[PDB]
Every structure is written in structure tokens, then in C-alpha cells.
Amino acid sequence: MLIYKDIFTDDELSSDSFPMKLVDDLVYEFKGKHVVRKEGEIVLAGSNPSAEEGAEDDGSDEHVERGIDIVLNHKLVEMNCYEDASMFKAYIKKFMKNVIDHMEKNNRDKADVDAFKKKIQGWVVSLLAKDRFKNLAFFIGERAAEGAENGQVAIIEYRDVDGTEVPTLMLVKEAIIEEKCLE
Incomplete structure (x- = not known):
């Protein structure tokens, strides 16, 4: 069990037994898994195939937090x-x-x-080079993105290891504080 906090989005950033690494003494490799939150029936393939935007003004999806x-x-x-x-x-x-x-x-x-x-x-000049890095999906904390804060972008990638897509978050050490919770 680990509680994760940022400088700006510290309050509610993250908190669970997530597998995390420190690479190059620079970036935290925070691994996740592709899932959907569907309030009725959790089916990963049971999501809206967003072709263009999926910006359906009255209900963008069917309560599928994909x-x-x-x-x-x-x-x-x-x-x-x-x-x-x-x-x-x-x-x-x-x-x-x-x-x-x-x-x-x-x-x-x-x-x-x-x-x-x-x-x-x-690192960032290489990392933002979409030629190969086009497998990045940029995300930002709901809190930082509301007030136009100085909060950093959570840099997500999907990776292909042993025939498994593994989505890994990349964050810098110098804006993130890992708080261990092992009683």
C-alpha cells in the first residue's frame, strides 16, 4: 500500500498498492492496467468506440469511464x-x-x-518526440486542470511486453512524493 502525492495535486493524487520504479534516478515508472468503470457491468470491450471525439453533449458514453x-x-x-x-x-x-x-x-x-x-x-526533449513517442497519451490532474495551475502532466504510455499491453505512467521524482503505508 502506497499513497502518492504531487506538489500541486497532493490532496487526492493516488493511494493503493501500485507497482512503482525509479529509472535513471529521474522518473517514476508507475505501472497500471487497461480497465473500464461501467456502473452496471464491467466489460473492457463493452465501451463506446470513440471514432472522432465521442463528445456526445447529452451523455458522451453509457456511464463507461473507459x-x-x-x-x-x-x-x-x-x-x-x-x-x-x-x-x-x-x-x-x-x-x-x-x-x-x-x-x-x-x-x-x-x-x-x-x-x-x-x-x-x-529526457523531455527525447520523450516528446512523437516520431516514435506517438504511443504517449497525456493526462493532467482534475484539480490542476480546473484552476490552470502549475501542476505537471501525467505522461502515460502503452507498452507491449510478452504479448501484453501495459500502460505505464511517467512522472518526475522532483514533483512527486511517494508515501509508504505498511503497518
Whole structure:
């Protein structure tokens, strides 16, 4: 059992026995599973095939909170850098300013911050390159997306390991605080 909190979306971000990793001492690999919340009958293939938008003004779906378990946990709103290029760029500027400044309070010395800065800046420039990274689905906490806050984007990907689609959340260490709960 682990309780997850962000700098901005700290309040209700996440809280369950989720498998999590720290890669490169930079990013948390937070694994989930593709599921649907359907208030009547949980069927994963029993969801609205959203061709264009699925923006049906009177009932977008049939109470099918379709997505991955990571997103459906706290109800994170989807965004795609294809159309959301400007909005997502705003959150990226918020992100890099937040994470480096967070570390500038932790370190200040230019030993760890400037090192971290090369890693995270280099990481995101590679990570946002849709040529191969087009398997990313960008999400943001309902709280941060309501007030246009300085909260970061939850970077989701679907991955194909041993014939299984595994959706893994990517978040930076420097805006996330893992709170272990083992009595």
C-alpha cells in the first residue's frame, strides 16, 4: 500500500498498492492496467468506440469511464500534444521551472540541480518526440486542470511486453512524493 502525492495535486493524487520504479534516478515508472468503470457491468470491450471525439453533449458514453486504472483512479483528463501543443507547452514551462526550483531548494550548490537539469531537459526533449513517442497519451490532474495551475502532466504510455499491453505512467521524482503505508 502506497499513497502518492504531487506538489500541486497532493490532496487526492493516488493511494493503493501500485507497482512503482525509479529509472535513471529521474522518473517514476508507475505501472497500471487497461480497465473500464461501467456502473452496471464491467466489460473492457463493452465501451463506446470513440471514432472522432465521442463528445456526445447529452451523455458522451453509457456511464463507461473507459481508460487505464491509473487515470480512472483520480479521473485524469486526456490531452494529445497533436492539438494541445500550445496548452501542453505551457505545462512543460511550468514543469521545468517547478522541478529545477524544487531541487534548487533541496541542493542550491549547482552540484545536483545542474546535473538533474541536463538529465530532465534532455529526457523531455527525447520523450516528446512523437516520431516514435506517438504511443504517449497525456493526462493532467482534475484539480490542476480546473484552476490552470502549475501542476505537471501525467505522461502515460502503452507498452507491449510478452504479448501484453501495459500502460505505464511517467512522472518526475522532483514533483512527486511517494508515501509508504505498511503497518
